[PDB]
Design a protein around this ligand. Structure first.
Ligand SMILES: CCCCCCCCCCCCCC(=O)SCCNC(=O)CCNC(=O)[C@@H](O)C(C)(C)COP(=O)(O)O
Ligand code: SF4
Ligand code: SF4
Ligand code: FES
Ligand SMILES: [K+]
Ligand SMILES: [Zn+2]
Lengths: 688, 114, 126, 48, 86, 90, 208, 95
């Protein structure tokens, strides 16, 4: 080791060379105060709050920027360190507006808190304060720029992580202002995260505005379900109502960021809600009814069905507990037809081996790669923090990214190879220029989008991409620990439904149409009543009336993701669990509770009563669904690739067009986001 | 694993104290039904005594059952001496409480509780 | 001697006066609380916390207040280590689940990296 | 207030009222907020 | 009335899963070619013991511990599953 | 004296600005004074060249300097509002 | 630091440190720690087997004469395996001084009752039975003192909720005050108040 | 600025009124629903906009220490007046 020895207040600590003073003090459990330093942004050094005395040095050093030399004694609590902190806090509070009551940052303000902890108790500023003109950067971020302390975390986030380059400083001196300088609207997929890292209330949440206050909120730690990234979140509630959604730091997923749908689609969670059971009346209209009547009218039809008479479509937001509940319920009637809306091709190995439908490398493994090939996807909007990790690897590891598909904006520069899928044969044959780039690389990463698998030639595309990945891995200098083949998912319910052995896509329903169809949250519109026979008994079970509920015969109001403790699996196979934040409104219930009560009415009672017993069943079907925050390695790419060479599906001539080309198509994808007024304001803002 | 006892060295002396406490409660119950002028029978109060003893019958720790005998003797001392009123004696009999749903199905019907 | 040997598992559920409904149906959660991303300070991520599963909060018909029937709704216990919290949950018969402590990983920072000759890690503004 | 009158405001009651408890003019409490969760209104048209 | 799915649970690194691992590297593919419409779900996990779940008609499931088996023993247990069909 | 832009009919992103071809040859000579890969270093002369042709800087000279140097427009707005010579009013 | 800072008393600090050394060397069988705070109070942390030998000593030694038991207290610290901290506060009227004798127990280990040393303790540790469940062996009349007669649990434990598990109302059917499982029309609103910044760097614990 | 629902019930300055099929109107049966009829959103809109000759104005709400904390309102936007965040008094630069 080449660790240098430094001293924090006399305590010896062994640090790597290049470590700053602030990190060396972090290693002994001391936290130097800061406003412009952030460990996921570049070093700025322009608030001077981190000034600390190195002893035998007649000048304080910016600890966020100064690297430790060997033998320094960092005096984190000496007298001139404290005089520096009080002076810098006095200058930060000189022009700062007396807005602490009317400010959403109050109670959770860095400026308030380390004014209390490190600055003076009073003022010497006998002058008039400046007042900055406000800006309009969109419907998500309220902007009150008098509160700005010019820390430039705006600009470093928008430039380095969001990759936007629209925020900046105009002017000079005390008149220097943060903004876009024009009436420009900062609408990224990661735009709300500037609300998080702004230490003051200059950037605040416009949907959350004025409604709550941090001390009275309860903090439930939970999981995002808006995509298959599986972002860790804090659902902060107050008196039984969801107030807002913050991120949790998870280094391997979402480092501390979330997308704007994750942050702001929580107000769709209180519109359009299914609160009571509904049945069809004598006139064909959905009328409110009791749970006994609804479950009896579903069980009387389920007892008459058998075999292929009953099927099921799982939706995009369904937990694994309800998935195995509905699978065991339809297996009691001897029905294997349990399908998802998102099509994965069952050719070759299919969903048997886990490796050919996971992001097998990791989200973290993007930092280990050196060539990333993206096929048929727009990862900016399908998985925005997978794209944020790609941009971080682009920025710091000099990652070479290529794309096969439409030339979308990914907030970095990629090598656009073309939108034709025939290029997937030109790289696999070695007649393409990027093929040698894939061969000479040491950590290649080939990501196929699951939205490209919605095409009719999805088996052919998956075969070609797996052929490329096994041409690289088995021949070139890939070690064997490194995974090349990767599939990026966009649906939170998909990977848990494939691990439980559903049949992805509704080909098993279009083949032989059932006379009874369950819809666990199936609002994709995949199978309408023009596909079914004349009187199909459609049972919708979910939390919104969006698409599948207006055509149902019996409606079963379900819990949403903030309303149940619920296992969801991301695109990299990591099983995770939400917690209960609020309870479901009205007579709405948790989903597998509904399925289990239906099974007790139908006389085919499932062998579980509580959530732990559901999870014992869930371990019985695949034991990685109960090992939380754990990515399990999936081997056997060779055998899945040898099975994929059997059927020669033909590639179509249609170019790879992802369904999401612009930020317009980002904000509404599921039943919670389409029922949101905030997402509607976002769409109306980006379309004008 | 070597702990300090309270009264009982092992479970035999402990069960002896449990047995003496059950004897004392069984003897006390008719006087309790008389002087508090309860609206129950001696059979019913002795069944409540037996229920309160058999609720704790799964315990295998001598110190825990020593403290259970201590707290049972405190309950009995507060009953023999008229320190409880009729209300404190009848709080063992949850009479005004509605019967809870016991199966899965009625707990599903009434609310969210497991 | 004046000491006895008890090899049994420690259980005080009969002594703590707790109704059985709030022993065998509650899920204790042992966790270090995540840092509030509104703020950069880490003094709340130092200790372990035991919370419980949230139960039903409903609207009071008179005032609209949040009425509850959960006694353990406001019960947050603080522990120095993970093993203390696990021993306290097992001592009281609470079925628990444990999240691991998530630290931020050591970052590599360089102010000169903002001004590289050839790398993408240049800043375009400051 | 004949010597030092109170400061006149337009929102101050011109008519003072005594304790109205026990009358039909008494304060009855109520929640002043609107409805939190919106319900899904099903379509009034048939579905066939 | 008939077999519906097969589930094989195994570890990646435990020695008890070793023969099960040697069953998948050699004998799974011509297994899957022989049963093209039968879901044989291979589920690797961290520290599980090897296991063979057979689901039959109407939700009935049989359970065979594949712990410490050789690949021939895994093959014989799996062909007992494929030939029984209870 | 302000540091935000408001679109007037005489100062908007469709106000007509374009360099003369001799000014494009001057811009080529300016960009050749800097290393390849740091074309952004020619923001300050070329923008000043846009002021020497037009007399001042509407926000299409800023956009043209951002467009022909392939830098973001905000990175030109920062330069135009930082330095006291760039006349953002005629 | 003249006007607003509490002035430090160094003479009492020196005298209490010396007397703490005195107690620690007269009674090494039981004394585990001796400490003096910055506001000059002496804490003698002892083993629970020495409740009677230490407290008799301080009551009867000619250089101690702590003839007064001011207060007797338990403190529930659940992260400790001996979660209850029994705190004796003693007053010497002769030497005009106060001492604090702290010891420990858990739910099952009995503390020896100090009624033979100070009769003042007769209710106090009885309160410690009622509020905490700490049993005191050889107590004269150990029973509840503050809770209601049918009360289950010990309220000043920190895993005990703020409201109870039961609440009372009069019921006209049985003509009786009855106990029912507690429901609040407004839940007690938990406020998370702790700042995420360190307040006192002198009390910083070393990391793991 | 009070108005009335079709049930005959007054709508508050918040906007709260019970539905027709809501049973909780029975609490006002034989009694009264107490609303305040001085809506502050209508009263602050009656205040005339203050024309000032400066670029930044200070507002404490009037009364000095009896008002709100003194804040500083910028008036560079001529599209919009500058509103006090506490008191709602609005200001315009007269140039
Ligand atoms: C009017 C209402 C009156 C209410 C009376 C409340 C008094 C409650 C006192 C409770 C005291 C106890 O529960 S001590 C019992 C604890 N003992 C144990 O855990 C050891 C196991 N004990 C047993 O199995 C007991 O049945 C026996 C009798 C000791 C042995 O039986 P097994 O042998 O077959
Ligand atoms: S940003 Fe902080 S210091 Fe400034 S007004 Fe808001 S709460 Fe107060
Ligand atoms: S608005 Fe906030 S994040 Fe942006 S520069 Fe100002 S203080 Fe920093
Ligand atoms: S934190 Fe180092 S100067 Fe801003
Ligand atoms: K903020
Ligand atoms: Zn004002």
């Amino acid at each position: 080791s080449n660790l240098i020895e430094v001293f924090v207040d006399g305590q010896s600590v062994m640090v790597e060379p290049g470590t700053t003073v602030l990190q060396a003090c972090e290693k002994v459990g001391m936290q130097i105060p800061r406003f412009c330093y952030h460990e996921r942004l570049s070093v700025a050094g322009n608030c001077r709050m981190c000034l600390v005395e190195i002893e035998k040095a007649p000048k304080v050093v910016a600890a966020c920027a100064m690297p430790v030399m060997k033998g320094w004694n960092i005096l984190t609590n000496s007298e001139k360190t404290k005089k520096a902190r009080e002076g810098v806090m006095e200058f930060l509070l000189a022009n700062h507006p007396l807005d602490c009551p009317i400010c959403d940052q109050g109670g959770e303000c860095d400026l308030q808190d380390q004014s209390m902890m490190f600055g003076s108790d009073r003022s010497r500023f006998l002058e008039g304060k400046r007042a900055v003109e406000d800006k309009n950067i969109g419907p998500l971020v309220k902007t009150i720029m008098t509160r700005c302390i010019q820390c430039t975390r705006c600009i470093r986030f928008a430039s380095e992580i969001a990759g936007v380059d629209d925020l900046g400083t105009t002017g000079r001196g005390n008149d220097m202002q943060v903004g876009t300088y024009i009436e420009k609207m900062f609408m990224s997929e990661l735009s709300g995260n500037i609300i998080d890292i702004c230490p003051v209330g200059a950037l605040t949440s416009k949907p959350y505005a004025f409604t709550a206050r941090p001390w009275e909120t309860r903090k439930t730690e939970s999981i995002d379900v808006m995509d298959a990234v599986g972002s860790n979140i804090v659902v902060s509630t107050r008196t039984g109502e969801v107030m807002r959604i913050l991120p949790r730091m998870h280094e391997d997923i979402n480092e501390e960021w979330i997308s704007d749908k994750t942050r702001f689609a929580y107000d769709g969670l209180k519109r359009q809600r299914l609160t009571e059971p509904m049945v069809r009346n004598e006139k064909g209209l959905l009328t409110h009814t009791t749970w006994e009547d609804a479950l009896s009218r579903v069980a009387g039809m389920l007892q008459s069905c058998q075999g292929n008479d009953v099927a099921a479509i799982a939706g995009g937001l369904v937990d694994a507990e309800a998935l195995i509940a509905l699978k065991d319920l339809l297996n009691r009637v001897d029905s294997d037809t349990l399908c998802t809306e998102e099509v994965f091709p069952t050719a070759g190995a299919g969903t048997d081996l886990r490796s050919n439908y996971l992001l097998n490398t990791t989200i973290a493994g993007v930092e280990e790669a050196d060539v990333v090939l993206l096929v048929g996807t727009n990862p900016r909007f399908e998985a925005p923090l997978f794209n944020a990790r790609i941009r971080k690897s682009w920025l710091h590891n000099d990652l070479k990214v290529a794309l096969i598909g439409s030339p979308v904006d990914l907030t970095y520069r990629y090598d656009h190879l073309g939108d034709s899928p025939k290029i997937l044969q030109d790289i696999a044959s070695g007649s393409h220029p990027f093929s040698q780039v894939l061969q000479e690389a040491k950590k290649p990463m080939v990501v196929l989008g699951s939205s490209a698998l919605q095409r009719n030639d999805g088996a052919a595309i998956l075969a070609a991409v797996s052929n490329i990945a096994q041409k690289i891995r088995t021949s070139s200098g890939v070690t064997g620990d490194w995974k090349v083949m990767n599939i990026l998912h966009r649906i939170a319910s998909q990977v848990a439904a494939l691990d439980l052995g559903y049949k992805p896509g509704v080909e098993a329903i279009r083949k032989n149409p059932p006379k009874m169809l369950f819809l666990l949250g199936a609002d994709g519109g995949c199978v309408t009543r023009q596909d079914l026979p004349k009187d199909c008994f459609i049972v919708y079970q979910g939390h919104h009336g969006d698409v599948g509920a207006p055509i149902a015969d019996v409606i079963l109001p379900g819990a949403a993701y903030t309303e149940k403790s619920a296992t969801y699996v991301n695109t990299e196979g990591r099983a995770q669990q939400t917690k209960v934040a609020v309870m479901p409104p009205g007579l709405a219930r948790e989903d597998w509770k509904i399925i289990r009560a239906l099974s007790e009415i139908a006389g085919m009672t499932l062998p579980y009563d509580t959530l732990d017993q559901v999870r014992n069943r869930l371990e019985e079907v695949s034991p990685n669904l109960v090992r939380y925050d754990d990515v399990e390695g999936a081997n056997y790419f060779q055998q899945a690739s040898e099975l994929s060479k059997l059927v020669n599906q033909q590639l179509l001539a249609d170019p790879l067009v992802p369904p999401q080309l612009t930020i317009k198509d980002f904000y509404m994808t599921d039943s919670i986001s389409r029922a949101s007024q905030t997402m509607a304001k976002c769409v109306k803002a980006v379309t004008e | 694993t070597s702990v300090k006892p309270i009264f009982s060295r092992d479970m035999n002396e402990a069960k002896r104290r449990v047995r003496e406490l059950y004897r004392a409660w069984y003897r006390e119950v008719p006087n309790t039904v008389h002087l508090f002028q309860l609206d129950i029978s001696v059979k019913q109060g002795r069944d409540k005594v037996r229920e309160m003893f058999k609720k704790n019958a799964h315990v295998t720790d001598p110190r825990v059952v020593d403290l259970l005998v201590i707290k049972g003797k405190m309950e009995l001392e507060e009953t023999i001496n008229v320190w409880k009123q009729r209300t404190h004696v009848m709080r063992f009999f949850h009479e005004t409480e509605a019967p809870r749903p016991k199966d899965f199905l009625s707990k599903f019907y009434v609310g969210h509780d497991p | 001697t004046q000491l006895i040997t008890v090899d049994e598992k420690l259980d005080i559920t009969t002594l703590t006066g707790v109704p059985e409904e709030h022993i065998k149906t509650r899920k204790a959660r042992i966790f270090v609380p995540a840092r509030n991303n509104m703020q950069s300070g880490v003094n709340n991520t130092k200790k372990w916390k035991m919370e419980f599963d949230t139960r039903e909060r409903w609207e009071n018909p008179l005032m609209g207040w949040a009425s509850t029937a959960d006694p353990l709704s406001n019960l947050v216990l603080t522990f120095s280590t993970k093993e203390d919290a696990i021993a306290f949950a097992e001592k009281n018969g609470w079925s628990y689940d444990v999240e691991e402590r998530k630290v931020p990983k050591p970052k590599s920072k360089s102010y000169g990296a903002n001004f590289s000759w050839n790398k993408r890690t240049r800043v375009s503004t400051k | 207030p004949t010597v030092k009158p109170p400061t006149a405001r337009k929102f101050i009651w011109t008519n003072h009222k005594f304790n109205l408890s026990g009358t039909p003019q008494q304060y009855v409490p109520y929640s002043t907020t609107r409805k939190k969760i919106q319900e899904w209104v099903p379509p009034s048209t048939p579905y066939k | 009335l008939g077999l519906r799915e097969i589930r094989i649970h195994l570890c990646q690194r435990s020695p008890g899963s070793q023969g099960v691992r040697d069953f998948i590297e050699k004998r799974y593919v011509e297994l899957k070619k022989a049963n093209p419409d039968l879901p044989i779900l291979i589920r690797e996990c961290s520290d599980v013991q090897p296991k063979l779940w057979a689901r039959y008609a109407f939700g009935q499931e049989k359970n065979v511990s594949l712990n410490n088996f050789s690949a021939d023993q895994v093959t014989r247990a799996l062909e007992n599953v494929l030939s029984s069909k209870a | 004296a302000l540091f935000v832009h408001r679109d007037t009919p005489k100062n908007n992103p469709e106000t007509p600005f374009d360099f003369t071809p001799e000014n494009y040859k001057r811009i080529e000579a300016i960009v050749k004074n800097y290393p390849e890969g740091h074309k952004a270093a020619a923001v300050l002369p070329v923008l000043d060249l846009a002021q020497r042709q037009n007399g001042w800087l509407p926000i299409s000279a800023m956009n043209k300097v951002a467009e022909i140097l392939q830098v973001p427009p905000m990175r030109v707005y920062e330069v135009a509002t930082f330095y006291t010579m760039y006349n953002r009013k005629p | 630091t003249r006007p607003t800072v509490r002035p430090r008393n160094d003479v009492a600090h020196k005298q209490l440190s010396a007397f703490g050394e005195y107690v620690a060397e007269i009674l090494p069988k039981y004394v585990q720690q001796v400490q003096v705070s910055c506001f000059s109070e002496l804490e003698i942390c002892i083993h629970p087997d020495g409740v009677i030998p230490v407290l008799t000593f301080l009551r009867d030694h000619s250089n101690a004469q702590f003839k007064s038991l001011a207060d007797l207290t338990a403190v529930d610290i659940p992260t400790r395996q001996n979660r209850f901290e029994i705190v004796y506060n003693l007053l010497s009227l002769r030497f005009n001084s106060r001492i604090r004798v702290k010891t420990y127990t858990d739910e099952l280990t009995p503390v020896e009752s100090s009624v033979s040393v100070y009769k003042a303790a007769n209710w106090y540790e009885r309160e410690i039975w009622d509020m905490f469940g700490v049993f005191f062996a050889n107590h004269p009349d150990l029973r509840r003192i503050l809770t209601d007669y049918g009360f289950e649990g010990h309220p000043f434990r920190k895993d005990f909720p703020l409201s109870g598990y039961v609440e009372l109302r009069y019921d006209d059917e049985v003509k009786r005050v009855v106990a029912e499982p507690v429901e609040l029309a407004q839940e007690f609103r938990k406020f998370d108040l702790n700042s995420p910044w360190e307040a006192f760097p002198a009390y910083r614990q070393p990391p793991e | 600025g009070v108005r009335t629902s079709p049930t005959g019930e007054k709508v508050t300055h918040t906007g709260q009124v019970y539905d027709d099929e809501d049973y909780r109107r029975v609490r006002f049966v034989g009694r009264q629903k107490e609303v305040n009829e001085n809506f502050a959103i209508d009263l602050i809109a009656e205040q005339p906009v203050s024309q000032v000759g400066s670029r930044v104005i200070s507002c404490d709400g009037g009364g000095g220490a009896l008002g709100h904390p003194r804040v500083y309102i910028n008036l560079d936007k001529e599209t919009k007046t500058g509103t006090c965040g506490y008191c709602g008094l609005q200001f315009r630069q007269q140039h």
